[PDB]
Design a protein around this ligand. Structure first.
Ligand code: NA
Lengths: 30, 21
């Protein structure tokens, strides 16, 4: 479900789901 | 950044996993 355009909360929810308990970092300004 | 890679263009599992801890 990750091979599409994922923006904003849609991106953060894909990160939350794929990463699990490992957690993630969301740095929108790169 | 992830926004260029996943919102402005199509994302992939490889790119997402790159932001997991
Ligand atoms: Na891309």
């Amino acid at each position: 479900f990750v091979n599409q355009h994922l923006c904003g909360s849609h991106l953060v929810e894909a990160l939350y789901l794929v990463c699990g308990e490992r957690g993630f970092f969301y740095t929108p300004k790169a | 950044g992830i926004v260029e890679q996943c919102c402005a263009s199509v994302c992939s599992l490889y790119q997402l996993e790159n932001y997991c801890n």
